[PDB]
Design a protein around this ligand. Structure first.
Ligand SMILES: Nc1ncnc2c1ncn2[C@@H]1O[C@H](CSCC[C@H](N)C(=O)O)[C@@H](O)[C@H]1O
Length: 212
């Protein structure tokens, strides 16, 4: 039934309504609920420096209603890790590679929490990246994500020492994209595919190569 839609520069003309809706939900969730005050904006849209022409959005849609999602950004451009949190990756270094994309802004609307959507969103990042030939995703995440990643079978590689970020323990890591990880998740969600790709085909790795 309901799917996760891959939205990028090549097909966003089919999703302008949905994209604006997701920016407002991000404000509701990350600003009003999670109190990430540095992200508050007077337009009520949660938009940062990594929302541009090269961003890819993976949004869970029920009809045209956004119920969850996350985003991917090429590490060949200045990234949140390289610009905002490079000290979190001081041991191994910040990623910079067309085959590594930065993963952020994971959310589920209140109406869909503690249900089937969460594991579908985990499957979605693996499915999209495997299809595109992306090898790893990078993340700056709160340490409570570690057991969640492990529960979903995600292979995680820490890049530096955990540190407090605005009162919350946070760490930089890569996640390995794995066919085997995805296969298990497909079985668990009971669907052979969770990512829908409408409109023109996106060549993500090619685009990321152009960026650097
Ligand atoms: N573009 C940005 N610039 C500066 N800080 C940001 C940011 N995006 C998120 N943050 C901060 O990072 C912390 C959350 S943890 C890091 C980012 C988070 N995993 C995400 O998905 O976005 C919060 O304190 C938040 O205010």
């Amino acid at each position: 039934g309901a799917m996760i839609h891959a939205i990028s520069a090549v097909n966003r003309h089919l999703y302008e309504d949905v994209l604006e809706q997701h920016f407002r939900l991000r404000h509701d969730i990350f600003v009003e609920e999670r109190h990430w005050e540095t992200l508050r904006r007077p337009d009520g849209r949660e938009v940062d420096s990594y929302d541009d022409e090269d961003t890819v959005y993976l949004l869970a849609l029920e009809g045209r209603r956004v119920v969850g999602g996350h985003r991917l950004y090429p590490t060949t451009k200045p990234s949140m890790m390289s610009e905002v949190f490079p000290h979190l990756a001081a041991v191994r270094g910040c990623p910079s590679d067309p085959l590594i994309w930065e993963w952020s802004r994971y959310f589920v609307v209140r109406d869909r929490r503690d249900g089937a959507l969460n594991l579908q969103l985990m499957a979605a990042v693996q499915e999209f990246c495997l299809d595109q030939g992306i090898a790893q995703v990078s993340a700056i995440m709160e340490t409570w994500w570690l057991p969640r990643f492990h529960e979903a079978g995600f292979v995680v590689t820490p890049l530096g020492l955990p540190a407090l970020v605005e009162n919350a323990w946070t760490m930089a890591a890569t996640v390995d994209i794995r066919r085997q990880t995805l296969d298990v998740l497909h079985d668990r969600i009971g669907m052979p595919s969770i990512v829908q790709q409408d409109g023109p085909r996106l060549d993500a790795v090619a685009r990321a190569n152009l960026c650097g």
